[model samples]
Target chain A: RKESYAIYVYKVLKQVHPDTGISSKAMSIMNSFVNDVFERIAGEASRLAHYNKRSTITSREIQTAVRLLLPGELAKHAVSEGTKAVTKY
Target chain B: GLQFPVGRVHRLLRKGNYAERVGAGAPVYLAAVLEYLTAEILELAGNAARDNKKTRIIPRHLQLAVRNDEELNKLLG
Candidate 1:
């Protein structure tokens, strides 16, 4: 079966907003949108590692990809959350 | 090594309405985080220049390197 990223997104939405329910169409659209962005980010991150002559992609590379992919406040939050996750260990 | 001040980042976060307060480790990691991002962009732009057999990385190289990005294409679109 094809994996439905939208379904998982809806799952998380449910987790975050228990009182809220997502429209199937809306969830599918967001799922497609999110997956497109995710694919773009992942492709760039992988290419960055290749450009660096590194076979393994590090968090630093992903961070770079995050910055490249996002803008302004969105970029800032991405870094903050990434850093927050790192320091949580 | 001394790092870019987190207080600056904290203030920016507050100004952006992203966070009310910057945590203690914020300055430390945020500095590196920003560096990593900018460094990659610069590196790619430089590479783009080199690919064109140019001696210098021009602004257009940077513009192309940045504007032609996979995710950024959609982002900048």
Candidate 2:
């Protein structure tokens, strides 16, 4: 019984709306959405780190990646939330 | 702070050719942000399903929800 990424997605959906369910097609789309965004940010952060000659990817690189990928207010929202999480850790 | 596993997040980050080393906090922050985005998209998709009088959210519903939102359209469109 291997854990699949869709299980985590289902958990999110359940927490958000218990009454709603996701179709198979919808789940696939959701998975792809996560993957695409994650890859984009990770790739960009890696590039930034390499350019700056930093061997380690820091929170700053992640922040810059989010800023570069996400637009305007959305980026701000994510940055604030992400910063809050990082600060607490 | 997020429910998603940090290890899995780190592994996903590794799927791309990221830096050889990753700060401990990088995956944590990314996991939190990813959870936030997941919740946001789920809410929109749920509403789309509801609007159509359907209990199950389908691909078209997700597409319609994403397309109708300016921010999401730019990100996921």
Candidate 3:
């Protein structure tokens, strides 16, 4: 599970599909897939933070990183989703 | 040697209906925008080749580069 990231994928899948269950086989593919995506976003945000001379990754870093990773309007929903999440907490 | 000529951009704008009466500064900005985007494309294409340990960037590399997007993972599809 540590190498597969399958557990983490299931957690995210639960948010979207509560009753429907995912096949462990499918989760295996989704496992590394999600890891790659997260790593990409984090890597980009890290670079952004570094360029800004900041030690910590902030909201703006996430915003820009997501925009760069997800093309044009594809990230519109997720980007808006995060803004409200951080706005409250 | 790498300067993007503004005249072609002005001409390209004329292709659009509202492209009439284009401003001089507009061309300069267009040239800059094209150059930056082109550079990014080349870098991405170059990386595709480098990932495979190849020295040359082939057409297939460009095809893969554009499809690197997880959402729409195909170029010209």
Candidate 4:
């Protein structure tokens, strides 16, 4: 249910920023941008997870939403990097 | 450093196409219009940062940009 909402939000953003002719780096930036925007609007990502009914964020949730929304390999790479950055840092 | 053209609010309202749409009165359409403009403002802020022009984006620049766009001006009004 929470993942559904998160995915819904991502879909809204994806509609705004279609893959089209976007570059990999831009997509990565967009991934971060989306997260930042979502976080800014909804509060912390961890808090969003709570709202989503998940104990923690899974790569599948983020990736599945992002992949569907974006084009090329950039969205995937950005999701991977974002997960790593979130967990590692 | 920030120069906002005066009377921009009126300019956008009268010259901009926003009046026509607002008169049309669909809440969802209004929301979409607001969303698009908000994104445009954010993009302008980002571009300003990328250009190293200023660290802060004031309301004036926003007013200027909106004023230049007839559609945006109308919507704002």
Candidate 5:
């Protein structure tokens, strides 16, 4: 979507800091962050798929991509969450 | 703030094969978490953009932001 991802930002901050506010420019920056992170994982996953001579990207490649991109405990948590969802499917 | 809808967030989560049945609060909670991260990243990106005398945040500015932050570099690097 072309819309900013900052809609949630206000809601999120409202829980803790009800009177605080973010500027339009700051919201734009938040939008960029989401898109940037999404593309980084997708690009990494695509590269992993190609490196393994695979035509289609699989959950395995995404898991590996997350591992490589997200480090340490965060990667561990992400992979576990991903695997949990994949197993359910 | 920005304009992303919670419905869209739920859709994206379902697409990722999140629990076959999502709870009413899950999407909102996730949205909050993501927004928190967005805010964190934006703080650094804004500084990077300003340091280079740029009015807008560029990809390189974001790159520099992540590069300069230990945790962010570990996550986004």
Candidate 6:
């Protein structure tokens, strides 16, 4: 159920903004953004890394899992910020 | 004044009347509004909970006091 909430959040963001050619820098920032937002809202540290012993963060991991696993509105803020920045310039 | 009970907010949400009040439209938009409002409520509740070192949010603790407005729900929903 908790994971379901995160997946819903991710789907909402994807609906709002389909993935384009995002730069590595942007992608890294996005990952950090997602992590920070989720940790703050959920009051829990990153479980994936702790439980799975993952050493590195990947764009795909962020897109398929982390993006969706975040708390709802906070995750939307990440997408909103990304869209706004992309559209601004 | 459609009042929701303390432990029944989720149950109330599943009711047909509740969804009808919001109008029949795209689920995404409705979800967005719900998500945003839920975040706001969580922020407030988080503060209250932290101040008291409590672990749970009761419905009575929602300081913003959201009322069930059919018209507004129809507009957003």
Residue-level lDDT of model 2, residues B5-59, one tens digit each, is 7898887666556878788888988877777787888898899889889999999
List, residue by residue over B6-75, the lDDT tens digit for candidate 6: 1232332234132222112112222333344334334443445445565433343333222232322222
Off by over 4 Å in 5: A1-4, A8-21, B1-69, B73-77
Better of 1 and 6 by lDDT: 1
Estimated TM-score for each candidate: 0.50, 0.91, 0.49, 0.26, 0.49, 0.26
Candidate 1 Cα outliers beyond 4 Å, as residue runs: A1-3, B1-77
Off by over 4 Å in 6: A1-89, B1-25, B64-77
- The positional error of residue A10 in candidate 3, measured at the CA in angstroms, is 2.7
Q: lDDT for each of the candidates?
A: 0.51, 0.83, 0.48, 0.35, 0.56, 0.32
RMSD of each: 17.8, 2.5, 20.5, 19.4, 8.2, 20.3
Every candidate's DockQ is 0.04, 0.79, 0.02, 0.02, 0.12, 0.02
DockQ-derived CAPRI band for the predicted complex in model 4: incorrect
Candidate 5 residue-wise lDDT, A1-89, digit = tens? 34455656555544433444445655565566676655566567567666766655556665676678765565665566555544432
lDDT of 4 by residue, B1-77 (tens): 00111123223323433222111112222222223334453454334433545443344444454455554344332
Best by DockQ: 2
* TM-score, prediction 5: 0.49
- The residue ranges of model 2 lying beyond 4 angstroms of the native Cα positions read A1-4
Better of 2 and 6 by TM-score: 2
Evaluated at residue B66, the lDDT of candidate 5 is: 73
- The residue-by-residue lDDT of candidate 3 on B1-77, one tens digit each, is 21445465455444432222444443343333333333333455556666777655555654565567544352123
Q: Write the per-residue lDDT of candidate 2 for residues A1-89, one digit (tens) a residue.
A: 12246877888898998989999888988888887887787889899999999998888898899999987677888899789988875
Q: Assess candidate 1 and give its TM-score to the true structure.
A: 0.50
- Cα deviation of B63 in candidate 5 (Å)? 13
